[PDB]
């Protein structure tokens, strides 16, 4: 219900925004799709200008709202590119006041913040999960669970007899994404 | 001759009759280089002529020497000349070396009129008028708001009797009345944009763009002349109501435009900076709270805490600030501003917003335009400086369109920087107590600092002067005396002396407040320059500003003290 | 040389606009030219201009219509195709058939921009709706063009009812690739 | 400059300029062959001067090209001046 | 055959587009250009007379704009023709000297174009002789050799692809196809293929196959 309304709001924002004569985000999405670049960069200033309620919701609980934005972006991309693709990625640009790194505290837990620093170390690419195929040890029931990176998932403990943790992952029919760890000073 | 408000259409028709043939350009518009109102007037006139398909050229001018130079440069083929922002407080006939006998072409005895090959049109608001430019020459044509018929009848009769001429006593009394009239300060009475928009309404070519330009022009006088803005405000309200379409149920569309009245506050770039910065870099707020000392900052912090807005939230940019406080701001200000004396901050102002782009108020737009005019970008240095200012004029001209938002953003940033620098300089001046007091006037002379370079453009020096006038010179139980502010420039060894007039407390309606405070600096400056010899450069259109050599500053100040004419 | 490098074997968008403006359009005059000087153009008919009555529709070239609108002496009649309902119908037609192209006028992109810029208050429908519908039509046409580029050969190609602007867009790439393929085939024989 | 051209190339340039002058002076005199290939557009435009100059007396008229002074003239009149770089179409 | 000034302008536009998009140098329409130049001169004189003497301002503005547009079209056409002459210079000389071919520069160019061709050929020959050729032996001083490793005469491309719109007659070549529509028929000799061109459609065809139709004005290049 509410999720569908938010998705529709994001879709309308993407499909209707225009500054002077060019649909910025529509053309950007088309160009990115053409070169096999599945991402969209959105300037928060435009989002605030179009409709302040959408930005209010986005800033309130980003971990819950951002995935819906990705879903809307993917739907619009499919509409624009395929005549009647992986889940796209949302990249944000902002011009809000920077919060000093040393000043981050519990007050800013689960909020969008802008800071600056110097990178001192980077790791090697990992392989996170995005779509897992699971089969039960005893009764051999096939199922799939989708995962989103944002946290506000684990293997089922109860089979959908079979004891605790009865599911194992079928790795030949799963999809993964890249991950990296950085350190900021 | 003077054209009444009802006669503007006739002058416009004369212009269209003379300089309209597609053969070649025959209209030249001269514009003051450091006047925003003149800029808006010129822009609106250019739009009108463009719609009417008339060849024209526009030439920015600064000072009086450039005016004479350019006029001598002009071609004979030119037939209509437009002056906006100047030419009202001088004897234009003598200055331009114009003898009508040469310009006369057709002399018909039956009509008793001599047609001329060039017509000079003056669009000026400064008073008093020069009778020789009003009741004298026919070549010079003046656009009058109504002052001439309102309060110049006695002087009109005196001038006519003097021209026509026991009898010695009568001639002496008439000349005495004329000298009494000519011996008074110079002050602005009206906005030129209002005159041009009255012409437009007479010809019925009004739209939202012209009304917005008129609003911009009239608002520029708010900082200096509050009486003019108050007098001309109700009409703007009526016309904004008239032109604005009532239908607004539709949500914002990309092409939507809305020019409506919203609560506007006497704050600095509220919609393009942080609330704390808006309350910090403000003339009125600082004057009321004297923020230049630590106790003022403590009072401001206490006020913000009482209003319920946190300190971190108050310093967040306006766009990204929490929307709840943005919605409830008016209620908060109403509830918690009487206590600290800032009850005059609340005001009604015009706000224009284009679809999906942030709103901008008239005051902020004017501030951005002035910042672009000021800081945007021997005799050789002087020429380079004046030509840079001329180029800045055009840099500001383009920003007045909807297709050049980048220039507007740059102007806003430059305005922020300039206000920060002026605030720092004013803090230094007030802390070090450099404002010496005298029975007649007050003196503030700058001789060192890191920002002394900026104080060569007259507009920036006037900004500093207004800043100082508001703080402790108009409030804080202080008598009203004219203030002389000067700034050195070792690169040329001269002082950009400026003679500023006092101001009554802002937002205090009273009978004395109604009467304008005339500026008497011009006549005393002229007399002192005539008596002595210090190579004073009296060429700026505003006589309040001159340039005095470094070695001759103190003698000139002593002469001014002895003058007793302020 | 006598001709610039980019104007060889193709056209420029300014020249495409020049060509498009040479077509007739309907307008509502605001003056009364008909008698109870007068136009003598040589490239275009001058009888219609000399005989115009206010508020009575007449036909004149698009270039002259824009010139009149510059002075605000006429009101341009938006073509029937531009209206919203026709745009939704054409979008549905395009969606239904994933192989053929719609039958919009050849000058459906240049005229759209010219009218949206010069005449922004003559339409009987919201401007933003028209812009969105035109954008959707253009995107679907781009998809179909991309899909159809995979069938280039050394014999010929057919693109029925394709606007002039899209043909101008695609003229260099298609022509050059087909020429190279034809050269290879000719060498093979 | 011409220092990069061999004397034969300098003669070539002179002769080709002569030829260009020759064609333009024939029956194609109504059309200025050495014109602009950008199609015509709005008849009247605003042009800003980019270089201080005197009261140059062109065939179309006398334009006092005072630096930083805008004009409102027909595009045809100031086509060549724009080409030479005195004016800007803004 | 004179019809009307508007017909002349339409023919001028058609010729301009064909020349711009064509791969070869098309024949010169002498009579049309003579008439158009005469009309331009007379119209300019009439404009001067009218301007010698505010309801008439807009008519005159339209006059001037129309004259500018016509002048631009003619100038562009002439420049395109001159460039095409420049590229195929030696080939034109070979065609003219070759008596077997009925084509003649007098039947393919105007007086200005022939003057330009002659003068440019002379100047370029002088330059190459002064710089390079004079130092070569008698076997390698001919600027137009057709027996060496690479042909020195660059001929027009006879199979360049071009966008064509099948206008149809303003005709034995017209045979109505199976889908209820008139259509022309052409043959590609290299591929032994037969192609059918239906009216009111846009194709991408070789130039040689449709050259006769373009000459007859059945089809027009886009
Ligand atoms: Zn199980």
Swiss-Prot record, chain B:
Give the GO molecular function terms: chromatin binding; DNA replication origin binding; single-stranded DNA binding
Name its GO BP terms in alphabetical order: DNA replication initiation; double-strand break repair via break-induced replication; mitotic DNA replication preinitiation complex assembly
The alphabetical list of record keywords is: Cell cycle, DNA replication, Nucleus, Phosphoprotein
Q: Do the record's keywords include Ribosomal protein? A: no
Q: Does the keyword Membrane apply?
A: no
GO terms under cellular component: CMG complex; DNA replication preinitiation complex; nuclear replication fork; nucleus
What InterPro entries does the record point to?
CDC45
Q: Where in the cell is it found?
A: Nucleus
- One matching Pfam family, short form? CDC45
Quaternary form?
Answer: Assembles into a complex with MCM5/CDC46. Interacts with MCM10.
User: Any miscellaneous information on file?
Assistant: Present with 1730 molecules/cell in log phase SD medium.
PANTHER family for the chain: CDC45-RELATED PROTEIN (PTHR10507), CELL DIVISION CONTROL PROTEIN 45 HOMOLOG (PTHR10507:SF0)
The free-text function statement in the UniProt record for this protein reads: Required for initiation of chromosomal DNA replication. Acts at the origin of replication. Also has a role in minichromosome maintenance.
Name the UniProt record assigns to this protein: Cell division control protein 45
Where does this protein come from, organism-wise?
Saccharomyces cerevisiae (strain ATCC 204508 / S288c) (Baker's yeast)
> Gene encoding this chain?
CDC45
From Swiss-Prot, chain C:
The disulfide bonds in this chain are none
Which InterPro entries does its entry note? GINS_A, GINS_bundle-like_dom_sf, GINS_Psf2, PSF2_N
Principal cellular location given in the protein's record: nucleus
The subcellular localization recorded is:
Nucleus
User: One cellular component GO annotation, for this chain's record?
Assistant: DNA replication preinitiation complex
One Gene Ontology biological process = DNA-templated DNA replication
Keyword tags = DNA replication, Nucleus
Q: Kindly state the subunit structure of this protein.
A: Component of the GINS complex which is a heterotetramer of SLD5, PSF1, PSF2 and PSF3. Interacts with PSF1 and SLD5.
What does this protein do, in the record's words? Answer: Functions as part of the GINS complex which plays an essential role in the initiation of DNA replication by binding to DNA replication origins and facilitating the assembly of the DNA replication machinery.
Q: Report the sequence similarity comment from the record.
A: Belongs to the GINS2/PSF2 family.
Write down what this protein is called. DNA replication complex GINS protein PSF2
Organism name: Saccharomyces cerevisiae (strain ATCC 204508 / S288c)
Print the organism lineage.
Eukaryota, Fungi, Dikarya, Ascomycota, Saccharomycotina
What is the primary gene name for this protein?
PSF2
Swiss-Prot record, chain D:
Organism, by scientific name, is Saccharomyces cerevisiae (strain ATCC 204508 / S288c) (Baker's yeast)
Q: Which stretch of the intact protein is present?
A: 119 to 208 of 208
Other remarks on this protein? Present with 1431 molecules/cell in log phase SD medium.
Q: Which gene encodes it?
A: PSF1
From what superkingdom does this record's organism come?
A: Eukaryota
Which protein are we looking at? DNA replication complex GINS protein PSF1
Please spell out the taxonomic lineage of the organism that makes this protein. Answer: Eukaryota, Fungi, Dikarya, Ascomycota, Saccharomycotina
Family (UniProt): Belongs to the GINS1/PSF1 family.
* Assembly information from the UniProt record: Component of the GINS complex which is a heterotetramer of SLD5, PSF1, PSF2 and PSF3. Interacts with PSF2.
Could you tell me where this protein is found in the cell?
Answer: Nucleus
Function, as annotated, reads: Required for DNA replication. Functions as part of the GINS complex which plays an essential role in the initiation of DNA replication by binding to DNA replication origins and facilitating the assembly of the DNA replication machinery. Required for the chromatin binding of CDC45.
UniProtKB/Swiss-Prot annotation, chain E:
Please spell out the taxonomic lineage of the organism that makes this protein.
Eukaryota, Fungi, Dikarya, Ascomycota, Saccharomycotina
Give the main location.
nucleus
Q: What is the effect of changing residue 221 to P?
A: In sld5-13; temperature-sensitive mutant. Defective in DNA replication
Its job: Required for DNA replication. Functions as part of the GINS complex which plays an essential role in the initiation of DNA replication by binding to DNA replication origins and facilitating the assembly of the DNA replication machinery.
User: Quaternary structure per UniProt?
Assistant: Component of the GINS complex which is a heterotetramer composed of SLD5, PSF1, PSF2 and PSF3. Interacts with PSF2.
Any keyword Nucleus? yes
User: Cellular component GO terms, alphabetically?
Assistant: CMG complex; DNA replication preinitiation complex; GINS complex; nuclear replication fork; nucleus
Substitution effect: residue 15 to P? Defective in DNA replication
Q: What is this protein called?
A: DNA replication complex GINS protein SLD5
**Is Aminoacyl-tRNA synthetase among this UniProt entry's keywords?**
no
List where in the cell it is found. Answer: Nucleus
Source organism = Saccharomyces cerevisiae (strain ATCC 204508 / S288c)
Q: Which family does it belong to?
A: Belongs to the GINS4/SLD5 family.
The alphabetized UniProt keywords are: DNA replication, Nucleus
Q: Name one GO biological process term.
A: DNA-templated DNA replication
